[PDB]
Design a protein around this ligand. Structure first.
Ligand code: HEM
Ligand code: HEM
Ligand SMILES: CNCCc1cccc(OCc2ccc3ccc(N)nc3c2)c1
Ligand SMILES: CNCCc1cccc(OCc2ccc3ccc(N)nc3c2)c1
Ligand SMILES: C[C@H](O)[C@H](O)[C@H]1CNc2nc(N)[nH]c(=O)c2N1
Ligand SMILES: C[C@H](O)[C@H](O)[C@H]1CNc2nc(N)[nH]c(=O)c2N1
Ligand SMILES: [Zn+2]
Lengths: 404, 403
């Protein structure tokens, strides 16, 4: 019947149609000839159209579409672009835009929380020292002694001619990755490059598996400066297992706060190259991805030998048995330490509730199935059985090239 | 133009150039990706698909441009021009069936694609004969637990008449009986087909694992009911290597996964009945068939027998019970000497397949959402492998249910 993507839930046998994808102004990587959905990373005229669109979104969100204030804001922006080549967001537009960006993020399973986001305006920042202060305040507010709070700090937008504000680190908290003379890596292999960049920039390196990286912070047209986080601001959780007593002896830990700092926040044509945001972890991110990926800490075989599993054959499911206990330990230790965490079952359930909310609110919800489905116990969570439509809406969080 | 495909565990990059041979559109557009949807929403044509297929065949035997190649193009051309259609030689059919398997983006088992026994059943005139061919298929494929991939191909669709159809989705399925109080005894996926068998005069049982009769339809006739000789249906009792109470659950599954509702398309010809079988990957039985909420849904029961904390999600009881169920399946098949493959071995061999196919064809169509197993996804190498999905012909396709 209806000329929109038909979406089915296979568990519940229920059908919806996604009408929201109609508002997509940007094309993704797919064509009728081939699907590329599994790939991880696939001007006044243009600015004004993008800005007009966002102001329309904004005034709709406050139910004043067509109003006098709506049309004056429209003229205010058009004139401003016509004199400076760019424009500025009012504070409340920025708060709306940052929330809409999160709400729009197809790969985030935690979007039920999208309306609860503290937005810190840091668009007055003028130095790297000042960026450090804002970041520290963010970590403090967001960490909140374990009772984690979603937040984003927004630094000054891209300016014509001028250089960008950039945070070189991919997250505000990351473990060092030290390449060894025998080819291997101590710490996190995901962070080898940034570790080497820190060292070249004056950092004295440690030699632990869990050394916290300093921040490399870049103000416009200046070389990045190096800032060490004071340890007390970085909440870490030592990992133990509820029944396997030896697990604590492994000496594994993880940081409380997932704080992504390398993404670009795009709102109404304006690009915020530095706008770090944080939430809380889903257990599988730490337990399965960071600790068990072969190209990460890769501790699966280690745990399995302690569990006395037959690691000589795939068919013992030793990988699965070990991964479950690691995830259980992440969950148990965070709960024990009273630090906010969510398991992949609770997260996915809450995401289905989000899909139902957005279905009523907006006629659909952009979602990237491969990313939404958790990396262990896939078909055990309800999102596995949920068809999803993927597309790009704006405001948006976007990937950006590394500054170097 | 050509997609840059990356493996994120190894850092390596390939470029898929095979996708340029796709002549059939998928469900995605630049505006939106629909890759997670399970099902889809004359003479000039047939002749071009026929030429293209004949070209693939003679290219496969390294005989392109030869005399036999040329004469075979003229036969097909002459037959279509006169009759609106044509027929495949048995050799072409064998090649076509193998290519369809090779091209199936959702199949993790494709390392095996060149080892496929093809039965020509195109001389079938009745439901009775379909039943004979099917019994032979199962006997061959089962082979006392040493499973061998097979396909049996029934007469192609024809302009005038109805299709040969097997109404069952697989040759071997368990009944699903809808109880008065809404709930279902047996396999809920098969409530509809189980009802159809009953209406057509089948005496139903009341078990959780009652093997269904086959509903076979010869063109433009009512389907007929045939009961599979119980000795033809190898089943495996499920037990656990260390949990002795597990066998007490009376769990079982059949040996032979034999899909019978899909359409085989070769060179423009369509074969509406063409059941095929290989062997199970353990997670199909353990995770999806037994643990899915809309199937046998045994997770909570098993979790209670392990004395797990069902009260909360954060105890990962579901994850724990699922692993022991998959282990039970592997153990039980290995103990009954019935071919099976775990999802780790399967995915490892699919990576080998991708590498072979990269050298052979310049790519490999793959549906990531289907290739990554339903438990322990990122613990397998395919998870970290970018994949390109597209449609090549010959191909297996879905088709409407004949009722
Ligand atoms: C509040 C708790 C939150 C949870 C549980 C959560 C959960 C997740 C998870 C599990 C992923 C998958 C990432 C991976 O496996 O690498 C993800 C991706 C993502 N999240 Fe959320 N998130 C939360 C808060 C936030 C916030 C506050 C934002 C932004 C304001 C956000 C934006 C994103 C974006 C943009 C992605 C995609 C990243 C990419 O494409 O690389 N999330 N989220
Ligand atoms: C030899 C052992 C084989 C294994 C281990 C295997 C494995 C699998 C698995 C695990 C799936 C996903 C099925 C599901 O989740 O329901 C699948 C799908 C599929 N397989 Fe294979 N397979 C084998 C042989 C074959 C053969 C012989 C053929 C055809 C000649 C074939 C054709 C297909 C097709 C067309 C699909 C997609 C089914 C659909 O879209 O519903 N497979 N396979
Ligand atoms: C290897 N991933 C490529 C992109 C990338 C790189 C570095 C970090 C990264 O994190 C994704 C991400 C973003 C936001 C999150 C918010 C909360 C949360 N629990 N996880 C979150 C995870 C994503
Ligand atoms: C529910 N999936 C869509 C249609 C459908 C209907 C009934 C059965 C079915 O099985 C998929 C399928 C196909 C071929 C297979 C080959 C081997 C194997 N082990 N499993 C296989 C599984 C597929
Ligand atoms: C190749 C594939 O896209 C890649 O491994 C993806 C799969 N799904 C993912 N899902 C999440 N949440 N995070 C990831 O990093 C990935 N990686
Ligand atoms: C909605 C989603 O596409 C659907 O559940 C898919 C996911 N991946 C799958 N993968 C396999 N092998 N088999 C399936 O039936 C499915 N189902
Ligand atoms: Zn797609």
């Amino acid at each position: 019947g209806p000329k929109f993507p038909r979406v089915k839930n296979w568990e519940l046998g229920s059908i919806t149609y996604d009408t929201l994808c109609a508002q997509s102004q940007q094309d993704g990587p797919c064509t009728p000839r081939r699907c590329l959905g599994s790939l991880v990373l696939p001007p006044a005229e243009q600015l004004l159209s993008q800005a007009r669109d966002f102001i329309n979104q904004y005034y709709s969100s406050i139910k004043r579409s067509g109003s006098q204030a709506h049309e004056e804001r429209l003229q205010e922006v058009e004139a401003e672009v016509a004199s400076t080549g760019t424009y500025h967001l009012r504070e409340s537009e920025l708060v709306f835009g940052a929330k809409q960006a999160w709400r729009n993020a197809p790969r985030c399973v935690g979007r039920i929380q999208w309306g609860k986001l503290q937005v810190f305006d840091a668009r007055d920042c003028s130095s790297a020292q000042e960026m450090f202060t804002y970041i520290c305040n963010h970590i403090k507010y967001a960490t909140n002694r374990g009772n984690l709070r979603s937040a984003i700090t927004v630094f000054p937008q891209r300016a014509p001619g001028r250089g960008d504000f950039r945070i070189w680190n991919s997250q505000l908290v990351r473990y060092a990755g030290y390449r060894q003379q025998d080819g291997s890596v101590r710490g996190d292999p995901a962070n080898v490059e940034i570790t080497e960049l820190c060292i070249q920039h004056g950092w004295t390196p440690g030699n632990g598996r869990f050394d916290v990286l300093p921040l490399l912070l870049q103000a416009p047209d200046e070389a990045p400066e190096l800032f060490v986080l004071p340890p007390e601001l970085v909440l870490e959780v030592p990992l133990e297992h509820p029944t396997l007593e030896w697990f604590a002896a492994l000496g594994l830990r993880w940081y409380a706060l997932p704080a992504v700092s390398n993404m670009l926040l795009e709102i109404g044509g304006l690009e915020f190259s530095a706008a770090p945001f944080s939430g809380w972890y889903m257990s599988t991110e730490i337990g399965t991805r960071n600790l068990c990926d072969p190209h990460r800490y890769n501790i699966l075989e280690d745990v399995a030998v302690c569990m006395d599993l037959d690691t000589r054959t795939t068919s013992s499911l030793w990988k699965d048995k070990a991964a479950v206990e690691i995830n259980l330990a992440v969950l148990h230790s965070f709960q024990l330490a009273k630090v906010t965490i969510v398991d992949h079952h609770a997260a996915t359930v809450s995401f289905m509730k989000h899909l139902d909310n957005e279905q009523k609110a907006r006629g659909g919800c952009p979602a990237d199935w491969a990313w939404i489905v958790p990396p262990i116990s896939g078909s055990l969570t309800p999102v596995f059985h949920q068809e999803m439509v993927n597309y790009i809406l704006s405001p948006a969080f976007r990937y950006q090239p590394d500054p170097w």
